[PDB]
Design a protein around this ligand. Structure first.
Ligand SMILES: Cn1nc(C(C)(C)C)cc1NC(=O)Nc1ccc(Cl)cc1
Ligand SMILES: CCCCCCCCO[C@@H]1O[C@H](CO)[C@@H](O)[C@H](O)[C@H]1O
Length: 332
């Protein structure tokens, strides 16, 4: 145990190792920017909010620590440190996570700077590279969106999950298909890419039903091959009565754009999730010829997520989370 110190920021009490100095809030879990003295770099410190209040909250805390500890990739958020002031399992009630401070997210970059095709290839390439890694650990993001993409002054990017919200969501998630293959994240990428190319939100729906309406206007109402696969009689009938929107020609939609960018978008923005390009396939697409290195697109170690099936007591999840804090080994 290093030495800790108390400070109040925005009516929140923060107890951190003296290692971390100059704390100033960035967001509300609550996040502070800090100076890491041992390494002399700026970091973000997140104080977990009510981590062990319910069984579901306690499992989320554990899930969050388990995940961040596992993520070891350039284009994915990584855990620099995890600490608790607690001297013992009985004293355990707060969790803090430490990661790189990246100065800005992808909205910010898009909403005032017009991006070149080269900017788009590089930024999307990095999202796909990080996604290949995420997906190889049998993890699905489910909420990919520009605010979950941190970007530095070299436009190097990492994927995170900080916790408008639905403009990037796969149509199957908004019909609560409740199965979801990993290509839901690829839908999200198509939406992000289109917006980097045009500077405009692809599907800026006002509410849930407007969202879907806008999606179908571009990609059309489901074709016969898709409808064939819908096991739910009600879902089928919901779908089949809506006016039968034709699939738009993307070349006629994304006018100024690289024909290779258009081809890739067509392969990502498919209603049928069985037919969407995977992260690994997308990396070898010609759009990214300048960036693609098949020997530098690493996959993750096996990730044991059997805890996901488990129904445990708050204090069990708490103890399990406490073990993970203790076993943490900081990066090189
Ligand atoms: C839950 N989750 N899932 C992922 C992915 C899927 C991107 C690996 C990442 C995370 N969690 C986070 O990204 N958590 C997090 C913690 C501290 C800060 Cl300052 C910012 C974010
Ligand atoms: C309004 C009509 C929207 C239909 C879009 C949903 C089609 C998504 O695609 C479906 O996703 C499932 C994964 O969850 C798979 O099991 C199916 O095989 C696949 O076709």
């Amino acid at each position: 145990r290093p030495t800790f110190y108390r400070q109040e920021l925005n009516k929140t009490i923060w107890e951190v190792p003296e290692r971390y100095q100059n704390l100033s809030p960035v967001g509300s879990g609550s996040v502070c920017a800090a100076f890491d003295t041992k390494t002399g770099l700026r970091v973000a410190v997140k104080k977990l909010s009510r981590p062990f209040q319910s069984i579901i909250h306690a499992k989320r805390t554990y899930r969050e620590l388990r995940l961040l500890k596992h993520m070891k990739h350039e284009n994915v958020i990584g855990l620099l440190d995890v600490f608790t002031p607690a001297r013992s399992l009985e004293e355990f009630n707060d969790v803090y996570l430490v990661t790189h401070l990246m100065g800005a997210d992808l909205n910010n970059i898009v909403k005032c700077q017009k991006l070149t095709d080269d900017h788009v290839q590089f930024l999307i390439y990095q999202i796909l590279r990080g996604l290949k890694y995420i997906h190889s650990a049998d993890i699905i993001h489910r909420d990919l969106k520009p605010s979950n993409l941190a970007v530095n002054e070299d436009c190097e990017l990492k994927i995170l999950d900080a916790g408008a919200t639905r403009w990037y969501r796969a149509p199957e998630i908004m019909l609560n298909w409740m199965h979801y293959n990993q290509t839901v994240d690829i839908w999200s990428v198509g939406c992000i890419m289109a917006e980097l190319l045009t500077g405009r939100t692809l599907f800026p729906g006002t509410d849930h039903i407007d969202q879907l309406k806008l999606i179908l206007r571009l990609v059309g109402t489901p074709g016969a091959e898709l409808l064939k696969k819908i096991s739910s009689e009600s879902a089928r009938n919901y779908i089949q009565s809506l006016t039968q929107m034709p699939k738009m020609n993307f070349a006629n939609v994304f006018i100024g754009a690289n024909p290779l960018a258009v081809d890739l978008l067509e392969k990502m923005l498919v209603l049928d999730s069985d037919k969407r390009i995977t992260a690994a396939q997308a990396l070898a697409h010609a759009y990214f010829a300048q960036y693609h290195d098949p020997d530098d697109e690493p996959v993750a170690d096996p990730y044991d997520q059997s805890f996901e099936s488990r129904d445990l007591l708050i204090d069990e999840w708490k103890s399990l989370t406490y073990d993970e804090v203790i076993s943490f080994v900081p990066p090189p």
